[PDB]
Design a protein around this ligand. Structure first.
Ligand SMILES: O=C(/C=C/c1cccnc1)NCCCCC1CCN(C(=O)c2ccccc2)CC1
Ligand SMILES: O=C(/C=C/c1cccnc1)NCCCCC1CCN(C(=O)c2ccccc2)CC1
Lengths: 471, 469
């Protein structure tokens, strides 16, 4: 079972002996720190951490003893605040005397603003605020996945509007293929759920149960898939029988959309000769509600997409839409699911535009690029102490390293406000108390072991909409 | 609770319908496919087998749950209820799968078979690749353990050159990655993988994983020491950094203590606060209880070099038997910012050029060690190589025209020692010809049971550097 006493960086076990004597309050905050592009971030994922790990009776006698035994060996010394943990057990029935205030989930906030704050509610527990730094900072991951996914949605929206004149099907155009390419089952669920803030297409099944348990949707499920081959289901037929595999699969899934990986041996042969000649009769007969989606999976991603489109354009009837861009017949589409990240997505859609192909033609799948190839320094997600009370006097505290101004932190008690022009500002030094800027946008979401405010997944999605969608 | 019926890529739910009719066997394998990182450490499959795959993993409730989810997720009924029910009824929900694998901790060149998977019941031909997704997650502990070992090789080379021995090597790269990984589960897995090569960690999650799944003769596989963070210095107020330092080193007067020194001005902290104001509290410390000064910002090489130059003028420096400068035994440095395999190399080489022994320094690495890694670094990949259809075995493979690097292996596979003592993978069942001795793979899972396993002590032994051996 999970033990919050064993869920911190080891060194934090020793910090209760390091703060100034007579310290009754430690107050800390989280930001995606500005760096001298990702100019705005989607705040998502804290509610998962609050419910799974921080709420309710999280301290027991057994958990205290267990931690004491492990730390004895791990440090080869007796440092461990057994008394401090016993106090929370006896006084609060093991509930954390902590208050957390946060911006609503789904909110889209510029870099360098306070996103949440943490402080102890009992003077004895001044050490507890930063004990939970480690677990709370892991919110960097769903924030960053949700943010990077939204930035990809912006690119897709721009090019789809330009080449087609609308945004139809935008939420279905970037699929999560990342389940195998993340570091753990838990990561898979968190990451998949963060992608679903922006899109509806996923093969990372783990995201669904996470959303149902911790957030919830009006709809039965937040994400959807369609039948699709993998190389095993083609190659099992034997090298000389690729056409047999294709024919069998499209006939098995004749009335729903079906994706067929087409590059096992020669993607260009498969498109021109197998799909384009031998099996053409099984393709042109398909419903608009049940297209074949041809899937290349190797080679230079842009060069391969353009060549596949070129081949299919010469084998199938192409129209020109009202913006002047070429469109495949409605029973045929393409999905590129190899080597797609934010950079290559941009290259591909711009390449398509230059060659006059509508973005209606194509969907994208992304795996490692979407869920694994991200770190905490992409958005500089960071947790810092900004205010303490010592001997009953508050002091505004901060770091400001001489050789790196980008690592300077904020001072004092913080609040988040709308500006007169409708943007965001973080007020420092308790200046929100002067009430010159309307209401603080941070709300209490956790207090003394209870989750005090929750958001549904539908609300989060609404908060995270693109401006272009709003327009 | 975990449900293996809901722990695969969505599209695999539809694959049972796509294989050739009358297929009784699907046989697949995992490799770190060949195209830096010429050899890989095999680690982490034992965790997956025990946590997720062994015993009764199918129940009536789990089947109904998956049926209900997939009905909405596909907007159609495509889920193989009958196939899963067969497993429940016939095998009391134990997976009729056999997995063979190289021993954990083994160091194997790229492009070799590391494990294989096949069904043991013809009805369950579709099951082999259902579990691809979970098994392929082994890329992560493999990659962490591998990249961590590559860093140990660098540290070994430079420590040996500047000091003449390897004393303390295993304590020189510390895992600081707990906050920087994507989940609690990842933290434990990744920390355990670093502990294959090193003994220093602040990612507490790794300890419990190892104890549960691998085991060590020692009470714990990894260790930490007291250390400050910016909040324990800055809480004292900007004019009282010296007061913070004095309090901390006095509280931890008889054990090693690390104290982050860059809150305001690292160079002032080293030269004036440690080097003058509090110098008397440093030179009095035991060899068993050094102060470790921790810079945490600026260019990593430049900052380390300047910190060492400052301390070298404030404290008595010696010259070791190799001609390199050495701080007194009560004083060391740790660089825990910006460290990855590339910057590690730059820092130790830069120290060597300035005649500073690698004894003087330890490193901590967080996102670089545990997060900034992907499955394409070692090209970890699972593919089908052999099937039986209508009673006839067929060697199968992919070989995409535009990427010969993606070509997969054909047929039944085995791993062998060559006459020169290296590894070779034989394809097409050629291992059966017996020209290359016994298969080095071992059966590790069969029909719901883990059949062979390794302690963490054995894994560490297998993963040793040549220089250590
Ligand atoms: O290729 C794979 C998965 C590969 C995979 C998975 C996991 C790991 N590694 C690889 N999945 C196929 C998904 C693409 C389906 C498209 C999306 C857009 N689209 C519609 O929105 C639609 C239009 C008209 C009618 C109905 C729907 C047409 C159907
Ligand atoms: O700075 C932090 C943690 C920072 C942190 C943690 C988590 C997240 N973010 C930042 N930890 C201090 C590590 C100090 C390691 C050295 C290794 C070599 N060494 C001995 O081998 C030794 C010498 C004499 C006696 C006993 C042992 C001296 C101690």
């Amino acid at each position: 079972e999970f033990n919050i006493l064993l869920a911190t960086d080891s060194y934090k076990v020793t910090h209760y002996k390091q703060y100034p004597p007579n310290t009754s309050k430690v107050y800390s905050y989280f930001e995606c720190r500005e760096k001298k592009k990702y100019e705005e971030t989607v705040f998502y994922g804290l509610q998962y951490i609050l419910n799974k790990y921080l709420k309710g009776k999280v301290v027991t006698k057994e958990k205290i003893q267990e931690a004491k035994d492990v730390y004895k060996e791990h440090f080869q010394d007796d440092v461990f605040n057994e008394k401090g943990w016993n106090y929370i057990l006896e006084k609060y029935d093991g509930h954390l005397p902590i208050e957390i205030k946060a911006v609503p989930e789904g909110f889209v906030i510029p870099r360098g603003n306070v996103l949440f704050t943490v402080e102890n509610t009992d003077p004895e527990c001044y050490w507890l605020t930063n004990w939970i730094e480690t677990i709370l900072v892991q919110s960097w991951y769903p924030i960053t996945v949700a943010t990077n996914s939204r930035e990809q949605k912006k690119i897709l929206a721009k090019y789809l509007l330009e080449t087609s004149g609308n945004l139809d099907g935008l939420e279905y155009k970037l699929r999560d293929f990342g389940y195998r390419g993340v570091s753990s089952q838990e990561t898979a669920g968190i990451g998949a759920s963060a992608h679903l803030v922006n899109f509806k297409g996923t093969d990372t099944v783990a995201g669904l149960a996470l959303i149902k348990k911790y957030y919830g949707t009006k709809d039965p499920v937040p994400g959807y898939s369609v039948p699709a081959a993998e190389h095993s289901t083609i190659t099992a037929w034997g090298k000389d029988h690729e056409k047999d595999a294709f024919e069998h699969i499209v006939t098995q899934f004749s009335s729903v959309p079906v994706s067929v990986v087409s590059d096992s041996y020669d993607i260009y042969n498969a498109c021109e000769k197998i799909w384009g000649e031998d099996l053409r009769h099984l393709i042109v007969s398909r419903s608009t509600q049940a297209p074949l989606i041809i899937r290349p999976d190797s080679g230079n991603p842009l060069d391969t997409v353009l060549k596949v489109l070129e081949i299919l354009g010469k084998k199938f009837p192409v129209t020109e839409n009202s913006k002047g861009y070429k469109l495949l017949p409605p029973y045929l589409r393409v999905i590129q699911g190899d080597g797609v990240d934010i950079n290559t997505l941009q290259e591909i859609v711009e390449g398509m535009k230059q060659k006059m192909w509508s973005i209606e033609n194509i969907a994208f799948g992304s795996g490692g690029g979407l869920l694994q190839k991200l770190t905490r320094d992409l958005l500089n997600c960071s947790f810092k102490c900004s205010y303490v009370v010592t001997n009953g006097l508050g002091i505004n505290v901060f770091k400001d390293p001489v050789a790196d101004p980008n690592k300077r932190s904020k001072k004092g008690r913080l609040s988040l406000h709308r500006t007169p022009a409708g943007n965001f500002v973080t007020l420092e030094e308790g200046k929100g108390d002067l009430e010159e800027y309307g209401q603080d946008l941070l709300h209490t979401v956790f207090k003394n072991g209870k989750v005090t405010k929750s958001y549904s997944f539908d609300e989060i999605r609404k908060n995270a909409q693109l401006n272009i969608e709003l327009e």
